[PDB]
C-alpha cells in the first residue's frame, strides 16, 4: 500500500492506522498540508508518528503519505552558499517562492533546485562497459570558481556503465549515469540521498598529521589543532567567539566550511546570516566571497525541536559528502549545548528516563557517535583520494561551570580545548584565549610534521609554556611581599612573560598586518623572544638593571616585531629582518 | 477560503472526568477544533478539542465542567480551529483573555481572520535590530537600553512593584524624538481584580489609550485562557508590526503565571511532569511566544518584547528564569534591596544587562556620548558600592579624599538617576543630562572609561 489514515492525534503525536509496510524512524507526510513526521512506534497495522510541525486542524482520516526513507539529505550541486534548517529546507528559496517572512508549515520544497543548469563533464576514464564500485567519481560539475563538485557514485549500489552522459548542461533531474547489475538496470541523477544517522563508509581511517593553520598566533603555536581533529570552545556571551568563528572561515587551509547554528536565538542567528554573505576571501587571484565554499544550517528556537536535534546530523553529513570528494572540510557546530536541550525535550516528550540533570541515558553516546565521525581518512573510490573533517563544537555551560552532563562529556571526547575567558575581554586582550585552562592533546602526533618542516619549534613553545606557568605562582607573591624581595633570576622571567602576553599572544584582528599571521612569521616571532630569554639567563649568572635600561631599544625591536606585515612584506624579508634582530641581541650581550 | 457546510450538533456525551468532556460518534473530528457546549439549562460554554481517537473526540470546556450532563447537553462543532478577529481599530480597546471586549464596546469588525498559533519567522528574513525604544525610565533607557526587536525580561519577585513599572513603561513609551507609528500590546496573565482594575484605570486616565491594545486575564478566569492570551496578543502584534508597519512593544506581564497554566493543562492530558513539576516541552512552548519578535527585511515594522516574570524565592536556577535567560537577550532586576530602601523604581543596574545596547545607542540614534556615560556611571557605581563597605569597618575618617567622593556620588545616583517617581517621563536626553550632573562631581582623569574626544564637549557646563 501507499496511504495511511490518521485515526487520532493527541498533540504532536499521531497514531496513524493502515500502515502495514511502514518502517521505524521513516519519514511520512501527515495531513492535507503534508506535515512531516517520523514513525516512532509500530503496533501491528498502526504506526505511532510524532509530527515535526504543529498539528492543528488535522482530522481523523487525513492521508498519511509514506515516503520510505529516514531523515536524509539531498547531496548534489547547488549547496554552496545555501542556507538550510536542520531538516534541510532551503530558507533562501522559501522566502523567494512564497514572498513572505514565515515558513508556511507545509513546504516540501526541494533542497536543491531542479531548474538551474549545471555544466557536467565526465571523468574521461569511464567508457560504456566499465565496472564501477561505490565511491567512484564519474563526473565533475564546475559549481563555482573555487569548488569543483565531483559527482560520485553512491556507496550502496554497484554495476557496469551502460549509459554515460555527454558533456553538457543538465538539471538535477536529468539521468546522467545508468548501471547494469545482475537483475535490473539502475539509473540515477546527480543527486544522492543519504540518511543522516548513518555513518558514511570509507576505506581506512588514517592518523591525523597535518595541522590547521587557523591564522591566530596563540592557537597555531601553543594549542595547535590538526585537520581531522575535534576541538571545543566555551560559548559565553562575549569573549572572542565572533572572531574565532570568522578567522577560521577566512584564513584557514580548509577547502569547504559548514556552519551549524543549532537552535541559537532570534537575533544571534540573524547576525550570522547577514555577516557571512559579506565576508571576503583572499584567494591567489582576486578577492572572493566566502559563500562560494560555505554552507549554513540555520536554526532559531521557533523552529521544530526535531529540526533542532537533527541539525547536527545534517551538518556532519554535508561535511562528509564534501569529505569524500577529496576536500578538507572544517565544520563548526555553533552550539552543542542548545542541541542537548533539544534531546531533553525529545526524550522528555517520549517519557524517557532522565539520567543526569534531566538529560537522557544516551547523551554521552550520541555525542561520541558524532565526534567520532571527524578524521583525516582515505576515501572510497578508485581515483585514490583523501579527505578530512574537523569539528569545532562550542559548549555554553550554565553559569560558566565546567561540571555539567554536556560540558564534562564534551571534554572527555574532544582533544583540543581553546579556553576563552570573560575576564580577558574586560581587559581588551584580543584574542581572549586563556592559556592555563586550555590544553591540546595533538602535540605527540604533530612532532613528525614539525621535525620535517620547521625543526626549531618543538622546544621553542615548551620554554614559552613554563614561563607563563611560572608567572601564576609569582603573581601571588608580588602582592604578598613585593618586588623588593624578588630574585634577579625571577624578575627577568616575569619581564619576558609580559613581553609574551603583549607581542606573541595579543593580536588585534582589525589591523591589516595581524589578520593572518603565517607560521613563518609565527616561528620567527618566538625564536627571537626565547633566545632573548636564555641569553638573559646567563646574564644573571655572571645585573637586572643594566639590561633593562641599555637594551630599551632592543626592547622596542621585539615589541615592534608583530608589525612585520607579511602580506606586503616578503617572507624572505621577514626572515631576513628576524635574523638581523638575532644578531643585535647576540652582540649586545 | 470560505467554508459553507452546516455544523453538526452532538448529544452523544459519553464521559466527564475533570475539565474534559468525552464525546462519541463524531464524524471526522479536527484536532484543535473549537466547539460550543450548550448546557441543559441553556447556558453556553466553549471549548477546544484536546485529543481525537477514531470517532471519539475529547473536548475540554473553557469555563468549567460543572452541571454538564450526559443526556441533555449538546455540543456543536464549528469546523475550524480558533481564529482571531484582528484590526487596527483594536488600539484603545480592553479585551479579556479569550478576545471578547470588556470596556462596554462592540465587537471588532475583523478586517482579517488570523490563527493564534501563527508561523515561525524565517531566519533568512529577519534582520538585526538597530534603533532604540524609549521607555522613559532612566535606569532602563540610560544604562540597560533596549533595541527595536530585543527580547528583554524584567526579573522580579512577589511583592516587588513589577506591575507598577509595567504600567509606567506603557504610558510613556515612545521611539526617540530625534530632532511615528508606535503601538503597544499589553497582555496580563493571572492578575488579580485589583491589578486588573489598576491597569484599566491607568491607561485610560492618562491619554495613552490611542495606541494601547490591552488584554486582561484575571486569576478567576479559566486557566486555558491564560495560554491563548499571549497567542492573541502576539497575533495582533504581528498584524500591527510588519503588516501595518508600526513599531510595537509587547509587555507580557507575569510570565510565571503563564507556565503555571501550562503545567495545569499538561496534567489534564495525563502527562508525566518533568523537571520541578513543569512539563518537558516548556523550552519549546516559551520560545514560541518569545521568538515572535525582531525586524524583517522588506517591511518597516518591528516588534520588541518585555516579558515580565516573578522568579520564586529569588532563584535564578528555577526553570522559569533559566529557560527565559537562554532565549531572551539580557535581563533587568527588580530587587528587594532597593525596594525596602524606598527607591522607585527599584532596579539595580549592577546585575542588569542589555545584550544589544551597543547597537541601540549611538550618534544617529540618541547622541554620541551614550556609550561612555553608561560605562562611566556603571564603573563609578561599582566603586561607590565597594567603598560603602569600607565605610563601616574602617571608618569615615581613615578613607581617602577619593573614596569620600564616591560616597557622595552613591547618595545622588540612587536618588536623582534611578529614583524617578511614577509620573516623571524623562526622555533619553534628560536621562543623559542627569548622567552628566553626577559625573561632574568627580574631576576628570578619574573618568577613565570616557575618551577625551567626548569628555571635552559634555563635561564643562
Amino acid at each position: 500500500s501507499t496511504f495511511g489514515y490518521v485515526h487520532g492525534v493527541s498533540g504532536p503525536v499521531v497514531t496513524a492506522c493502515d500502515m502495514a509496510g511502514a518502517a521505524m524512524y521513516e519519514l511520512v507526510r501527515v495531513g492535507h498540508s503534508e506535515l512531516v513526521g517520523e514513525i516512532i512506534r509500530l503496533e501491528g497495522d498502526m504506526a505511532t508518528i510524532q509530527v515535526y510541525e504543529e498539528t492543528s486542524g488535522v482530522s481523523v482520516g487525513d492521508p498519511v503519505l509514506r515516503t520510505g526513507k529516514p531523515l536524509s539529505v539531498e547531496l548534489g550541486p547547488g549547496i554552496m552558499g545555501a542556507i538550510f534548517d536542520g531538516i534541510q529546507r532551503p530558507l533562501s528559496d522559501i522566502s523567494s517562492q512564497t514572498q513572505s517572512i514565515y515558513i508556511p508549515r507545509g513546504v516540501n520544497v526541494s533542497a536543491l533546485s531542479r531548474d538551474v543548469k549545471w555544466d557536467f563533464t565526465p571523468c574521461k576514464n569511464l567508457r560504456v562497459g566499465s565496472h564501477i564500485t561505490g565511491g567512484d567519481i564519474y563526473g565533475i560539475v564546475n559549481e563555482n570558481s573555487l569548488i569543483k563538485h565531483k559527482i560520485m557514485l553512491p556507496p550502496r549500489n554497484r554495476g557496469t556503465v551502460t549509459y554515460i552522459a555527454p558533456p553538457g548542461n543538465y538539471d538535477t533531474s536529468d539521468v546522467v549515469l545508468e548501471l547494469e547489475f545482475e537483475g535490473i538496470k539502475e539509473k540515477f541523477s546527480m543527486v544522492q540521498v543519504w540518511p543522516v544517522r548513518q555513518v558514511r563508509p570509507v576505506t581506512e581511517k588514517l592518523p591525523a598529521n597535518h595541522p590547521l593553520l587557523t591564522g591566530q598566533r596563540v592557537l597555531d603555536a601553543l594549542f595547535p589543532c590538526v585537520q581531522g581533529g575535534t576541538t571545543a570552545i566555551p560559548g559565553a556571551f562575549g569573549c572572542g567567539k565572533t572572531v574565532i568563528s570568522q578567522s577560521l572561515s577566512k584564513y584557514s587551509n580548509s577547502d569547504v566550511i559548514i556552519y551549524v547554528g543549532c537552535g541559537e536565538r532570534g537575533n544571534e542567528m540573524s547576525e550570522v546570516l547577514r555577516d557571512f554573505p559579506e565576508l571576503t576571501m583572499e584567494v591567489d587571484g582576486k578577492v572572493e566571497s566566502i559563500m562560494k565554499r560555505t554552507a549554513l544550517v540555520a536554526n532559531t528556537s521557533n523552529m521544530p525541536v526535531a529540526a533542532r536535534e537533527a541539525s547536527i546530523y545534517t551538518g556532519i553529513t554535508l561535511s562528509e559528502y564534501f569529505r569524500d570528494m577529496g576536500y578538507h572540510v572544517s565544520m563548526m557546530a555553533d552550539s552543542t549545548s542548545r542541541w542537548a536541550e533539544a534531546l531533553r525535550e525529545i526524550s522528555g516528550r517520549l517519557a524517557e528516563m532522565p539520567a543526569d540533570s534531566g538529560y537522557p541515558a544516551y547523551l554521552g553516546a550520541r555525542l561520541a557517535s558524532f565526534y567520532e565521525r571527524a578524521g583525516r581518512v582515505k576515501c572510497l573510490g578508485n581515483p585514490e583520494r583523501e579527505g578530512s573533517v574537523s569539528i569545532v563544537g562550542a559548549v555554553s555551560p550554565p553559569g560558566g561551570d565546567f561540571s555539567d552532563p554536556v560540558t564534562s562529556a564534551t571534554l572527555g571526547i574532544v582533544q583540543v580545548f581553546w579556553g576563552l575567558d570573560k575576564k580577558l575581554a574586560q581587559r581588551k586582550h584580543f584574542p581572549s584565549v586563556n592559556w592555563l585552562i586550555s590544553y591540546s592533546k595533538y602535540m605527540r602526533a604533530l612532532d613528525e610534521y614539525y621535525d620535517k618542516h620547521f625543526t626549531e619549534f618543538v622546544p621553542l613553545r615548551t620554554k614559552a609554556k613554563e614561563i607563563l606557568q611560572e608567572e601564576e605562582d609569582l603573581a601571588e607573591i608580588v602582592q604578598l611581599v613585593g618586588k623588593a624581595s624578588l630574585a634577579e633570576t625571577d624578575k627577568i622571567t616575569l619581564e619576558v612573560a609580559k613581553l609574551i602576553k603583549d607581542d606573541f599572544l595579543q593580536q588585534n584582528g582589525y589591523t591589516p598586518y595581524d589578520r593572518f599571521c603565517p607560521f613563518y612569521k609565527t616561528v620567527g616571532m618566538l625564536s627571537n623572544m626565547i633566545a632573548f630569554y636564555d641569553m638573559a639567563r646567563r646574564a644573571v649568572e655572571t645585573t637586572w638593571s643594566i639590561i633593562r635600561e641599555h637594551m630599551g631599544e632592543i626592547l622596542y625591536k621585539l615589541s615592534s616585531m608583530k608589525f612585520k606585515d607579511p602580506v606586503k612584506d616578503g617572507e624572505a624579508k621577514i626572515k631576513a629582518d628576524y635574523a638581523q634582530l638575532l644578531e643585535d641581541m647576540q652582540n649586545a650581550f | 477560503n470560505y467554508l459553507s457546510q452546516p455544523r453538526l450538533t452532538y448529544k452523544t456525551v459519553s464521559g466527564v472526568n475533570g475539565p474534559l468532556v468525552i464525546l462519541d460518534h463524531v464524524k471526522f473530528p479536527r484536532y484543535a477544533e473549537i466547539v460550543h457546549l450548550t448546557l441543559p439549562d441553556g447556558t453556553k460554554r466553549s471549548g477546544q478539542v484536546l485529543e481525537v481517537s477514531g470517532s471519539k473526540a475529547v473536548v475540554q470546556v473553557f469555563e468549567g465542567t460543572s452541571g454538564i450532563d450526559a443526556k441533555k447537553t449538546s455540543c456543536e462543532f464549528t469546523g475550524d480551529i480558533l481564529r482571531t478577529p484582528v484590526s487596527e481599530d483594536m488600539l484603545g480597546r480592553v479585551f479579556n483573555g479569550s478576545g471578547k471586549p470588556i470596556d462596554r464596546g462592540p465587537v471588532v469588525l475583523a478586517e482579517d481572520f488570523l490563527d493564534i498559533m501563527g508561523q515561525p519567522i524565517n531566519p533568512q528574513c529577519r534582520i538585526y535590530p538597530e534603533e532604540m525604544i524609549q521607555t522613559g525610565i532612566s535606569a532602563i533607557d540610560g544604562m540597560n537600553s533596549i533595541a527595536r526587536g530585543q527580547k528583554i525580561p524584567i526579573f522580579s519577585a512577589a511583592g516587588l512593584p513589577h506591575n507598577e513599572i509595567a504600567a509606567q513603561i506603557c504610558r510613556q513609551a515612545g521611539l526617540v524624538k530625534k530632532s511615528e507609528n508606535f503601538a503597544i500590546v499589553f497582555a496580563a496573565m493571572g492578575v488579580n481584580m485589583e491589578t486588573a482594575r489598576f491597569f484599566k484605570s491607568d491607561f485610560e486616565e492618562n491619554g495613552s489609550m490611542d495606541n494601547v491594545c490591552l488584554f486582561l486575564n484575571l486569576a478567576n478566569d479559566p486557566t486555558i485562557e491564560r495560554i491563548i492570551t499571549p497567542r492573541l496578543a502576539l497575533t495582533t502584534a504581528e498584524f500591527l508590526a510588519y503588516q501595518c508597519e508600526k513599531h510595537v512593544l509587547v509587555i507580557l506581564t507575569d510570565m510565571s503565571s503563564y507556565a503555571e497554566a501550562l503545567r495545569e493543562v499538561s496534567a489534564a492530558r495525563e502527562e508525566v511532569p518533568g523537571r520541578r513539576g513543569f512539563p518537558g516541552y516548556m523550552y519549546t512552548d516559551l520560545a514560541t511566544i518569545y521568538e515572535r519578535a525582531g525586524r524583517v527585511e522588506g517591511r518597516n515594522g518591528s516588534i520588541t518584547q518585555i516579558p515580565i516574570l516573578t522568579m520564586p524565592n529569588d532563584d535564578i536556577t528555577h526553570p522559569i528564569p533559566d529557560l527565559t535567560g537562554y532565549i531572551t537577550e539580557g535581563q533587568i532586576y527588580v530587587d528587594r534591596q532597593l525596594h525596602n530602601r524606598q527607591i522607585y523604581p527599584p532596579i539595580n543596574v549592577l546585575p542588569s544587562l542589555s545584550r544589544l545596547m551597543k547597537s541601540a545607542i549611538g550618534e544617529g540614534m540618541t547622541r554620541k556620548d551614550h556609550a561612555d556615560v553608561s560605562n562611566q556611571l556603571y564603573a563609578c557605581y561599582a566603586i561607590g558600592k565597594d567603598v560603602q563597605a569600607m565605610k563601616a569597618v574602617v571608618g569615615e575618617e581613615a578613607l581617602t579624599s577619593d573614596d569620600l567622593l564616591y560616597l557622595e556620588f552613591l547618595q545622588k545616583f540612587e536618588r536623582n538617576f534611578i529614583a524617578q517617581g511614577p509620573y516623571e517621563n524623562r526622555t533619553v536626553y534628560e536621562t543623559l543630562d542627569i548622567g552628566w550632573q553626577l559625573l561632574r562631581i568627580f574631576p576628570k582623569e578619574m573618568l577613565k572609561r570616557i575618551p577625551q574626544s567626548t569628555l571635552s564637549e559634555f563635561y564643562p557646563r
Partner: peptide, 19 residues
C-alpha cells in the same frame, strides 16, 4: 517519575480491557 510512569502504564492496561 518512576512511580507516576508505573501508574500510567497500569491505567492504560485497565483501559485496554474495558473496550
Amino acid at each position: 517519575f518512576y512511580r507516576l510512569k508505573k501508574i500510567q502504564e497500569k491505567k492504560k492496561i485497565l483501559k485496554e480491557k474495558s473496550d
